[PDB]
Specification:
Chains A, C: InterPro entries: PyrdxlP-dep_Trfase, PyrdxlP-dep_Trfase_major, PyrdxlP-dep_Trfase_small, Ser_HO-MeTrfase, Ser_HO-MeTrfase-like, Ser_HO-MeTrfase_PLP_BS, SHMT-like_dom. The structure is a homotetramer. By secondary structure, chain A is α/β, with parallel strands linked by helices. Chain A contains 16 helices and 17 strands. Helices cover 40% and strands 13% of the residues of chain A. In chain A, 61% of the residues are buried. Bound molecules: ligand ZV1 (2 copies) and pyridoxal-5'-phosphate (PLP) (4 copies).
Chain lengths: 462, 461, 462, 461
């Protein structure tokens, strides 16, 4: 045994499974807003010898030896990270060691806050992520809610966007030490300046969780939260089109002046953020992911990537305006970023019913809770994203077509919800009813044949 | 732009770095015991299309859709996770989604324990990990020591082993809810039966953090902590020779019969999984999860049975070689993949030997010894057989590795006679062109010896 | 030494100090809303041999012996407590061991809640007590805020009373487990049914801190929170006119039915409340205070006590309507209980300035934060109470006179605030300025000579 | 209605109870060591006009007004609090507002420690108080064990003393922020110098909870914990013979000189006071605060010097009497006011002797012994000299108290030969008219002996 055998000539059970997921990725229309296809240049460094390296610590301050080469990859990933977002290395640092998006946020709380200190983050069914703190009125779901006390701020259920005033009201009563301006299902921009006004008012911290919009900020197509936020976290997938990892952008340098001494008051963010990642929470960094990220950060400071993000924005509206003009309402009026919040309630169906139908014809989205919803097991609305398919060189006409696929798929279950009872009934007929079974195999063949001829990034075979 | 351009063309600055580390791994003797060389088959799955698949949830109970294939992968990994450790699927479950070993341990604590519940783990200078609760004399270091209250147990310095008698005495006053039977710098076998008794007495859970010995347990060359623990965390790298991920083995099914006849169940499966997701993590790194399942399939094969059994013979060969050269070994010798060396007799300290051996491409790490306070320059080295054994090293090769080490020791010994402080020491190695030469001739001799050995994984990166 | 010597023939330094406080109590107009004069029948049991008895535990379940007589005093204080508030001993219990008002509340949180569980209580400057949780936007003041996370609910600064809607808003976001409907500076009643609606809505507990209004509830003159609250705490002084102690009224019996089994679901309040007091928080009960309380609870179920509370209510309005018709505004319109919230802002002065002036002429009140206030060191408004002087057999004409004393005292500092700068200046002139020094010695002589001829309760000499 | 009617007229039901307890106190032998008889002068201040004075704050810094007189009282109490323990007013402050001893201890913890910080106190079955953190095998009992994490230290069962060597060994692993040097059922002197060294080594605060020995310390008949502790909590009852309240003595002024020359201060005065109010308590019980100052003035007088010195001679007289009658004393004897008795040799258990002695008006309490688990019927009694010594008891009187005790022991011994369980035992004492007689003749003999002794306080209530 040499360890250099192929994955095919050794483990075929896994190799066929790899190609099936590749075929499934290629034959399908991926509309998960947080999904995206990675470049082969990044995947090559992901499956590299850098996986065989323990580099616990930070460059110049390891607790081992032989970290001489990985110290140049972190210090480069750090440079490329600040490069991609136009950040002076005198006002900003970055921690490239977070394993993913959730471990990145958990490190920031652990760094700045104390256990059970107060946190405000957008409520989860109001388009938030659970890493912002999610208590389910029965049990504490996210570890953010367990180790720290979290109170959510909500949407205005009429306007459909962030109630910057009720949040500006609760912060004075709740006196939090950290407010998280970041989303996972919200189709508008965010005023990262009213948040900073609320944060400066209640002496809190403004954390920017710019995941989902990571690339749009790097390509300068939407406003950058670094203008008025002091700590910015993000993942490396979603939009930045890299491998699965996380980042923590913290502001360094000088905070202000001693108005009566003239002494320098420094930003004390750095050494706390760096300490929380290691040694507190993590151990051996995934250096093979740091490289695959630095690769994707390089190809993010490039004009090729701005054309990508601009197409992503244009493909969002071209999916919204197409969906608007077909019998569908758009939460928050329409969109302003990469994803759209479809409301299926003014259409007689829901995200839970449409998904399973759409999921069965190689079109992948997810359910979503809209303001105009009534429960949880049947949420009214879907989450549709652009960056996934735009990487296959999708255009406005290419997206107005999958809308014609969606509406041609929504109106398949719409004749079954009017013919069956609940979710367990809905899905049951979709699999044996030959009038609907064969009705799906037509759309699946039409969806696969349409999508499979688009240039998928990454390796050809896996 | 297609996203199918190679890295060698798209980004040369990074591609030139993959070769600098691939050469450094190929040209150096790797003795960091927590380090192994992942196979090419597993590394292929690491950089696969699975990086583009958000599959939040668990096979079946998943939030999104389209996980029809990655469900079969995670279910194949869960199947191969148990077969490697000979676990009955009706008595054991496994969570294959921990991003690494540290997030695996934090998931167990978050699942079973409320915040500020009590955990006991071996002290860090005594051989324990950070994730077993390390608390400095002034600050809370590990996050386990922050969201939970931790008290460590110590070695018996006279024997270098875990003092299972002081643990039992201290665990009755501290009354923890979880005691951890995992180590990093421990050259001996853990008395898991003695641990469970203590955990039983004080109504606590026994956690086995077998990250260092996971491959030895899988090949059944050492006793298995599954026979005495009910929660087993492990890393998929190290002695398992896989991609960087973590696994949580737990018990399920009938706990015991009620004294009535009621069937008391196990309550790990649902708390453990809920802690990993949605509580702590999120999108499962489906590429590592698949790359892990490749390494697990190898661990079920006789090649691993011979590899792991060779890892033991090479540690003894490394241990006996140091002993015959007048080296003190903590606990006298070794029963696994590790060899703890005590350099205080020979006259050097681990901080100096780590620098010299590093300059000749012999990667080890300094280790504290039973006795000297943590506020002291360490007088010990931690050596590991897993890495080079994957490069087909054998018994006669580690006696040579010890020979190269001893020549490196006698250099820092000569330099220590010439150097005063430590920061001065790390300059005399780089400036004094008489010792700068001596290190170059040992570096070259070492690299020539190492390059001739095969390296698992890709050839160029 | 026999231990039976008099306090005079042994410690005269303390005896003269005792009589001076007695003379100070008699010669002055006490307007602290939480103060009151105790009956000699209670003070006799307070300084009794019951101080020499350790009775840790509860009747029938002591951990000593010889508690045979104190077991009959607790079981009687328990009976008299439920008697005074018309409570069926099958639906209600009481813990008579709380040392005071603050230790009573701290026991209820410790009993029902977990550390860092969530608590909502009326904000302190909005007429609350700190035992409801008071964080000062810098440090955690009350131990309620340290051991549990507290978020306050505020007053409507226009209406001047409890914003039952903004509280009904925050409870859904904050998801507390306990809301405290009790006041220390609020002149209206409290809807102990909208609170219970908010508590049943967010699955919280309704704690009634009926201190300040303890006697008014016992005399049936104002609504009783026991109608819709499940845990009721109170002190024994303030209105109930007893010794310094506390009480914890908890509901026992059956909570509801198992609608699918018919089994009894019991109120699990009792054994937690009893356990938190002993052994958790306290040790040896002050049996000499339990007796002095049971004495005052006896003389509270009597028609003599209803005449008292009715005079207290009538003396409040007769102080409000008198203050209204003299150039003073009343927060919350007027009053509805025992105390009035004077607003000195529409009069050019404040509670901090008036107090020190009033305090210097044997008239004792305190500062108070009204909604229409601008800071903290100079709060605009005073807190005036009835139960203190009403125990000296005060009538409406007797209270309209001290208002004529107050307004004749307010307009003494009103010529000094218009002649001095801040608080440190204000008080400084009051002590050397012979034009104001002698101007006070006239009012002090007129206040002392007026008040000293009223029947003070308690011992004649101390 | 004037509020000046006497209790004898206003409420007879309660007045008839003040006499039933006054008679029971006068007619019984009081051996509950935490129990003394308050003087009449202090009891006069207890039921005074000061109960009608809300004086929130501290002398000067007070919220309300009109506290011009109660300020002089609290300042007189603070002056007499220090003079009783010979404390320099420039080195020590005192908070005289704790409602009792338990709220006094909680104030110290809340002031100095953050929630879930670590406290070490003597175990409750070993002699410690609840407020030193008692944590059952299943539940958190004391509130100290809830808002803080507590680990107890134990006695050395071979010697009955505190094992100061296991404390130092366990305090290095637990690393507490506060160690408590207070006891309830401890018949010996605490090595406060050995405690402070341990607190110094692990960077912890030494708390002295001298509630039981406060009067002995005030009279300088035993070593003073102020000479080694920096926070001293105490009750104003027990050996101090005052009303029920608690005091917190702390250090202030210069801590030490900085190694520079900076003057490092003490940070207790402002944290301690803020914890008592506004953090924890509210309206100071000004009646107890004044009644305390009367008891403190007595503690500065030679009468207390003779009273406390007599309390010691009477405990030895009680100890030596039990020894000469074949009784086992925990730790062999006594050095204070207490005498711990071990009834396991004689054949009875503390739960049975407490019932028999209670039925003859000899009030003691059962005490666990070094050895038997807390889940066992206690085989020991706790006896105290403070109470009866206030009734002018002397050495020859306690030998008689032991004689009355021994006759009571031999009754339960005869009953134990006749009784099986314990709930049966407490019925055979009440039904069997042959033993019902035997207890009546001992009860009468005891009460006649006791009534002849004077009783501090009022005559009728
Ligand atoms: N037996 C055993 N061997 C190994 C080999 C590698 N590891 C993995 C972890 C390496 C060391 C953990 C660590 C990492 C960082 C610090 C650290 O930052 N300390 C102070 C901060 C205190 C202050 O700021 O006061 C400082 O340096 O500033 C530490 F104190 C220990 C282990 C292991 O975990 N256990
Ligand atoms: N050395 C020493 N002597 C004395 C003499 C009096 N005291 C003062 C305190 C008396 C005992 C403390 C206490 C008080 C109550 C319990 C108690 O409630 N236990 C369980 C609850 C557990 C469950 O419910 O599982 C139960 O009975 O139900 C206890 F377990 C100990 C002391 C002292 O503190 N120390
Ligand atoms: C998706 C997301 C995360 C978590 O990403 P993971 O890789 O699953 O950890 C965190 N924050 C935001 C805003 C996200 O959208
Ligand atoms: C290596 C190791 C871990 C995990 O380290 P990570 O790099 O975070 O995966 C956990 N416990 C022990 C004992 C280990 O050796
Ligand atoms: C005054 C008050 C208290 C506290 O009374 P204390 O005797 O000082 O402990 C508690 N709750 C309320 C509503 C109060 O008015
Ligand atoms: C008696 C005592 C206390 C206080 O008990 P309380 O009745 O609450 O005042 C505290 N510590 C010790 C050691 C005691 O003996």
């Amino acid at each position: 045994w040499t360890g250099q055998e192929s994955l095919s000539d050794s483990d075929p059970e896994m190799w066929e499974l790899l190609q099936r997921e590749k075929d499934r990725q290629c034959r399908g229309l991926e509309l998960i807003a947080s999904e995206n296809f990675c470049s082969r240049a990044a995947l090559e460094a992901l499956g590299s010898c850098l996986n065989n390296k323990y580099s616990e610590g930070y460059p110049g301050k390891r607790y081992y030896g032989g970290a001489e080469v990985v110290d140049e990859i972190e210090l480069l990933c750090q440079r490329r990270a600040l490069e991609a977002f136009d950040l002076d290395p005198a006002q900003w640092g970055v921690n490239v060691q977070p394993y993913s998006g959730s471990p990145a946020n958990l490190a920031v709380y652990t760094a700045l806050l104390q256990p059970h200190d107060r946190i405000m983050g957008l409520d989860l069914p109001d388009g938030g992520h659970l890493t912002h703190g999610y208590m389910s009125d029965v049990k504490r779901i996210s570890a953010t809610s367990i180790f720290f006390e979290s109170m959510p701020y909500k949407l205005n259920p009429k306007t459909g966007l962030i109630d910057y005033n009720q949040l500006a009201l609760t912060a004075r009563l709740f006196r939090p030490r950290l407010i998280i301006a970041g989303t996972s299902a919200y189709a508008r921009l965010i005023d990262y300046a009213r948040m900073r006004e609320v944060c400066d008012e209640v002496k809190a911290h403004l954390l920017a969780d710019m995941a989902h919009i990571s690339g749009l900020v790097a390509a300068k197509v939407i406003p950058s939260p670094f203008k008025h936020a002091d700590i910015v976290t993000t993942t490396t997938h979603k939009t930045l089109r890299g491998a699965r990892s996380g980042l923590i952008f913290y502001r360094k340098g000088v905070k202000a002046v001693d108005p009566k001494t003239g002494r320098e008051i420094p930003y004390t963010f750095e050494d706390r953020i760096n300490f929380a990642v290691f040694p507190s929470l993590q151990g051996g960094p995934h250096n093979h992911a740091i490289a695959a990220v630095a690769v994707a950060l390089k190809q993010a400071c490039t004009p090729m990537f701005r054309e990508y993000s601009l197409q992503v924005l244009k493909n969002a509206r071209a999916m919204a305006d197409a969906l608007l003009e077909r019998g569908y309402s758009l939460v928050s009026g329409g969109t302003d970023n990469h994803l759209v919040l479809v409301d299926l309630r003014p259409k007689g169906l829901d995200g839970a019913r449409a998904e399973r139908v759409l999921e069965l014809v190689s079109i992948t989205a997810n359910k979503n809770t809209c303001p105009g919803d009534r429960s949880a097991i049947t949420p009214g609305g879907l989450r549709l994203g652009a960056p996934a398919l735009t990487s296959r060189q999708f255009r406005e006409d290419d997206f107005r077509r999958v809308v014609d696929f969606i509406d041609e798929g929504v109106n398949i279950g719409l004749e079954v919800k009017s013919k069956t009872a609940k979710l367990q009934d809905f899905k049951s007929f979709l699999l044996k009813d030959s009038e609907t079974s064969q009705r799906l195999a037509n759309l699946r063949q039409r969806v696969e044949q349409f999508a499979r001829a688009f240039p998928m990034p990454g390796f050809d075979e896996h």
